[PDB]
Design a protein around this ligand. Structure first.
Ligand SMILES: O=P(O)(O)OC[C@@H](O)[C@@H](O)[C@H](O)CO
Ligand SMILES: O=P(O)(O)OC[C@@H](O)[C@@H](O)[C@H](O)CO
Lengths: 255, 263, 255, 263
């Protein structure tokens, strides 16, 4: 079924995770056709500034994510940054996420694949759509069986990303495809007004799921504040993409 | 508002070709009454990569052929001009004067089109940023144009490749009606060396994206037998596929429409 | 011999052309090894704004350019924008320039070639280096024998141009190559600090000449004010590129 | 200031390969006394496109081989790390710890390198703008790095292609010493599908441009027989050509030097 990966960018506190987790649980009950996966990073290991927020550590993070899964029965997903983190994270994460800058780091991919969990790789901003075939092969070699590739924009000049929707059908040849609606519009080192329009395009073109960072009060978020979707708008967007998908799916090309 | 579908053979290979395509477009205009069809075909391909490529049979022949299409089918007409002097003669038959992408910044060409009183559709140059079309529209308004369209046809992305930045649709909508060019956006500039390439497999998915995001019309080149086309043989849509594509975009437009943002 | 195309961007007045023409004449006498060509546009036909400066017309322009050639004995070059302008412009222009946005307009190229004059085509920001082979072929077909291709940057994301120096050796396979030092650093719809550094790169790589817009008081220029080189700095830069060329030429690759 | 030339085989195919290249680099260091040579070779290619490509013989073997080069020739050493734990063991032999381009934003890796007390050279990511390296240097300084280098190795330009924006040299010079990577800048990422491509014919012209613009050093991978290399066979410079290239860049640097702008 259609996948919806959502949650606050960073684990600012399990308190925050619970609030967002409650709303995602609610939507989960309203849209039984959709498979929801709660997402939040225990560490923002690639911030531009040394003075920016990273998180409260892996242990506190994994603990908070456990609280969400136990309290709401929602599947979990978080990203790893070094090989050693794969095992401990797999304890709670149903889907292990591979950062875009790290999509070519063989040992990280293998470490993730070895856990037995599903692996979602953010397509690097430097990668061409067809270059992801090799990424999937690394994971299959590592024992991975449920593999996802996420479209999150491609480097377009300086401090800008463009979404080449031709990537969706191309990547679909070797993996399930997820569209990252929030990072695709950010301006490296974004514009919220483009989030909805592009997510509509993604489902019209055809994908297997969408990824969206959401926060009760984006303006106060400690990470990606300019692009996180306000929690209150999540239901509306999900219903919208389901209706568009329903009509458009008739025309999705085979493989 | 009425959705615009601009379609026809890339080049006026012959008046016969035009009438064959026109017949089908007329049939579709009778079916899709919520669509305003405009028949398109260039009397001259003034910017081919190679000097040996097909250009056309001249302005005179071209206007005559287009007039026949309008006369026989009652279809609105659009064609592109390449130099200022062509605006006057073309305006006699063209309901919409089209400005080529490479020439979207040539002030006199824009002014020549604007003063004819006809609608003007400017292809956004592959070098232009979305927000920079504001001045293009300003020039047209300054020149007297009352109905203006901006067409998204891709942006230079590395060499011999174009990418469609759909953020351009809501941006350009701020100052003009927006049209999505479904066939030129997937072409590979200078791809085959002496000629440009293209990937037909992406025409349909990208047009679905265009209407989901929201535009005021689509532009599609269509030919009975693309493989035999004298220009853009790699991107022209088979004529038999036109009807299905249009129905599909009207369906996606309808369901997405309630979510189109207000500019 | 090494070509140096220089002059004010636009013909703001023949008065201005004479002042700049006097300095170019002087340098012409100081650097006998270099072939100087005076440049200035009679019309800026592609300004972004309808309210910007275009010029005083073709007649006034061609007249002013005549005054420079007659008074200083300097070769001339200006750009054309429509086919009909080729003939009248050829009366004074030794080199007919084809605008970057118009490098694929067949009739403009043919019209220029028909005049018998040399033709310099600005490589479009949308063109790949190898795509210029076809441009040269159009000119040869039109009777052109002295053909130049000018590097002026390539579209790199929005409102930015990058100079891919790989273009110099590539374009050299079918035409003499000129490097446009002033338009290559401008930001479409620039940065003067990069003019000298990149012109040094151009000669180190290897080219047949350089193109530089110069004005006595750039800040007051009616066109490309942010990138026009101050007249007083022209001599220094020319001497610099000659010294670099002298040493580097030993390593220029054959064809 | 003394010009830096970082050179060596892309990967530590064998200790034998290292000694053969090291011998030549040592010979050149005796000739070009105004140059500070640093021998480079990766103990692991941790980011190959294909799982079937050569990676290396492990950290242990690698450090041992590099130590032999430093021991036999008295040459400074540099190699790249891929995860934080590798900084400590590598620092035992590496005079300069190199940070891979894809990892230029991984805070812990940068910090791990900085605290070793060794110099740190960061390859500018293909996704990074020149002005955004300011924060990269800030992180290193924060972590205790006292000698920092930023290496220009090209920027993503469309798919499977990189372009070198030489404006990056004077920009990055504002906060660190700048190195130009003459061999990676001409490679075509994922060019051959399972592996990356490259155009050797552009290595020399672009390095001439680098020194004309002005940098503090150059980085060049060299191999006795590039065609047999287990990594970057399309871009590694034949070892016999190294001497000529270095003489040429020193000559161009000298004549251009008086014109280098003051940051
Ligand atoms: O095939 P070549 O001659 O490159 O021409 C490209 C065509 O696709 C051309 O007529 C196009 O739309 C013009 O810009
Ligand atoms: O040949 P593939 O495996 O693509 O690897 C690219 C190499 O050029 C690679 O080791 C490179 O410099 C790493 O980024």
């Amino acid at each position: 079924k259609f996948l919806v990966i959502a949650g606050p960018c960073a684990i600012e506190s399990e308190e925050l995770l619970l609030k967002v987790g409650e709303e995602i649980k609610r939507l989960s009950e309203k849209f039984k056709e959709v498979e929801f996966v709660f997402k939040s990073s225990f560490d923002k290991a690639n911030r531009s500034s040394i003075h920016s927020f990273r998180g409260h550590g892996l242990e506190y993070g994994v603990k908070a994510l456990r609280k969400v899964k136990e309290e709401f029965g929602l599947k979990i997903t978080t990203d790893i940054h070094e090989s050693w983190q794969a095992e401990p994270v797999a304890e709670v994460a149903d889907i292990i996420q591979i950062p875009a800058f790290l999509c070519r780091q063989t040992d990280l991919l293998l470490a993730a694949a070895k856990t037995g969990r599903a692996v979602n790789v953010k397509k690097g901003q430097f990668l061409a759509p067809w270059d992801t075939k090799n990424v999937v092969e690394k994971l299959k070699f590592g024992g991975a069986k449920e593999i996802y590739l996420t479209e999150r924009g491609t480097t377009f000049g300086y401090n800008n990303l463009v979404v080449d929707f031709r990537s969706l059908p191309i990547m679909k040849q070797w993996a399930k495809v997820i569209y990252d609606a929030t990072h695709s519009v950010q301006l490296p080192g974004g514009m919220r007004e483009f989030i909805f329009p592009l997510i509509r395009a993604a489902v019209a073109v055809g994908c297997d799921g969408v990824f969206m960072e959401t926060h009760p009060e984006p303006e106060k978020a400690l990470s990606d504040a300019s692009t996180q979707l306000p929690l209150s708008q999540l239901e509306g967007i999900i219903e919208a993409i389901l209706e568009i998908r329903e009509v458009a799916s008739k025309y999705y090309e085979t493989i």
